[PDB]
Amino acid sequence: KQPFERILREICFMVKVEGRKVLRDFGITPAQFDILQKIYFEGPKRPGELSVLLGVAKSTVTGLVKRLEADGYLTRTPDRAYFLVITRKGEEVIEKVIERRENFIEKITSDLGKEKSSKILDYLKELKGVMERNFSK
Amino acid sequence: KQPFERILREICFMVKVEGRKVLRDFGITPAQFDILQKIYFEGPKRPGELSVLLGVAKSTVTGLVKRLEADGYLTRTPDPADRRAYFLVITRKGEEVIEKVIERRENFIEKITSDLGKEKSSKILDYLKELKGVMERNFSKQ
């Protein structure tokens, strides 16, 4: 519950911010990255799915997507309905963020040693599985 | 490392989503909540800083903040060094929203730790404290 929630919130904040340090090199904004990673993970998205994700008006999504398309990170496919689809350039952004997060975790696994790292992974797997069972949809 | 990253990703996602389910009760959108939680944790923010944080134009920020101010979640205070500038600050009502998100997360984690049992939850908490510790030691790297 309490310290548990707080300690996990801090872990989640640090890993999030750590990965996003790579966006300093790309000039992709936080809202634009949110759009890219959602397409990366769930496939081609309709504009309304992005407005729900971000919590903004279509006009905001349209501006963000126009700029992403112009900068080669997104393209369109037909369904006169269209999905936004990520390009390889867009894919590499997400992959760099994941790599930076991975490497952050690698420093961690180094300071802990191999036996402890593997036990912590075993326990994280167990936590995740109990969490997934309790997670409503 | 790769499976370590993927497993933390899914853990963090589930607790994030679970906590944000309370926003439905308030009619607060994800971008609106991101403004409120930023101010909740870091204090007063200029409208330009909110624009940089969200990664949206100033016009979008204005629309988001105007609704939060009208509905009593945010208010405003002048910049004492510049008559032409102002800061957005959170109200009590705005705080209650963040507190209800945290409460929902605590309740979610309470069910998890109950399923795991006291002994295993303790072991896992010690490991997370260690992980948090090592992350803190490395979080300054640019």
Side-chain angles (χ1 to χ4, degrees):
Chain A
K1 44 286 272 276
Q2 214 191 162
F4 202 114
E5 187 277 327
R6 176 73 160 104
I7 284 153
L8 187 68
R9 181 206 313 168
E10 287 295 303
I11 283 156
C12 288
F13 184 75
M14 282 189 281
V15 67
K16 185 189 186 172
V17 164
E18 185 64 30
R20 290 174 174 244
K21 286 174 186 174
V22 316
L23 309 176
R24 295 170 182 170
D25 294 331
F26 280 102
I28 289 171
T29 74
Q32 295 181 313
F33 175 72
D34 282 335
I35 292 171
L36 287 180
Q37 85 173 136
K38 202 74 174 177
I39 301 172
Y40 185 91
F41 284 119
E42 315 190 348
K45 298 280 178 168
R46 307 187 181 263
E49 299 180 280
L50 308 172
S51 62
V52 171
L53 166 75
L54 298 170
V56 295
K58 186 178 168 71
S59 57
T60 302
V61 176
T62 301
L64 297 170
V65 160
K66 190 196 185 175
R67 190 161 18 144
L68 283 168
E69 280 196 72
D71 298 347
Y73 300 100
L74 289 172
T75 220
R76 301 181 187 192
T77 44
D79 196 325
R80 194 195 295 160
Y82 73 82
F83 293 78
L84 289 322
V85 333
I86 196 168
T87 64
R88 186 174 180 163
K89 192 190 172 171
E91 283 173 3
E92 283 156 19
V93 182
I94 315 309
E95 285 167 5
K96 289 212 62 216
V97 170
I98 291 147
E99 184 196 9
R100 162 74 89 144
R101 294 156 55 89
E102 282 178 353
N103 290 349
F104 185 48
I105 285 135
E106 200 202 324
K107 323 258 206 48
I108 301 168
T109 66
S110 295
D111 303 356
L112 311 159
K114 277 170 48 181
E115 202 188 24
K116 194 194 291 187
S117 279
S118 288
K119 217 153 196 198
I120 294 184
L121 188 56
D122 288 345
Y123 279 96
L124 283 190
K125 286 179 154 85
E126 198 176 4
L127 174 64
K128 184 272 178 154
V130 166
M131 184 174 288
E132 205 153 51
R133 192 173 72 250
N134 286 275
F135 179 71
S136 300
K137 278 187 275 311
Chain B
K1 165 186 186 185
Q2 153 186 295
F4 216 120
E5 196 274 331
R6 301 172 182 185
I7 294 153
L8 284 170
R9 199 196 308 146
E10 283 163 305
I11 286 165
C12 294
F13 176 86
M14 287 187 281
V15 65
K16 179 195 182 70
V17 174
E18 184 70 26
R20 281 167 180 243
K21 287 176 175 174
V22 315
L23 299 180
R24 194 217 256 241
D25 297 337
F26 295 96
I28 297 164
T29 75
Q32 285 185 307
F33 180 66
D34 286 332
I35 294 167
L36 287 175
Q37 75 166 159
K38 181 53 60 183
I39 297 165
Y40 177 95
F41 287 119
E42 317 195 344
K45 296 293 183 177
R46 308 180 174 271
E49 293 173 338
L50 296 178
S51 168
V52 172
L53 162 82
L54 292 168
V56 292
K58 303 274 170 51
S59 49
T60 303
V61 174
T62 303
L64 304 165
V65 165
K66 173 176 65 184
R67 270 191 268 165
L68 289 171
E69 284 192 286
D71 301 330
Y73 300 107
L74 285 187
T75 190
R76 200 171 268 238
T77 188
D79 182 356
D82 178 5
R83 341 234 85 157
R84 278 152 31 89
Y86 66 93
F87 291 87
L88 299 136
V89 293
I90 197 161
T91 59
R92 227 297 103 174
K93 188 177 179 190
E95 288 184 312
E96 286 160 358
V97 175
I98 281 80
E99 292 175 351
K100 279 175 190 162
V101 169
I102 293 174
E103 173 181 277
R104 171 69 81 102
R105 290 166 67 102
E106 289 174 348
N107 299 343
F108 184 47
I109 294 299
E110 177 171 58
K111 291 191 199 309
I112 310 329
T113 59
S114 179
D115 282 348
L116 289 159
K118 194 212 168 181
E119 180 185 349
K120 185 166 286 165
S121 300
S122 291
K123 256 106 162 204
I124 288 168
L125 193 41
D126 288 339
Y127 289 148
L128 293 164
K129 283 165 169 173
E130 286 196 290
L131 173 72
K132 183 179 91 87
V134 188
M135 285 183 169
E136 282 171 357
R137 176 187 314 150
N138 290 101
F139 196 52
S140 72
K141 189 165 151 181
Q142 302 300 289

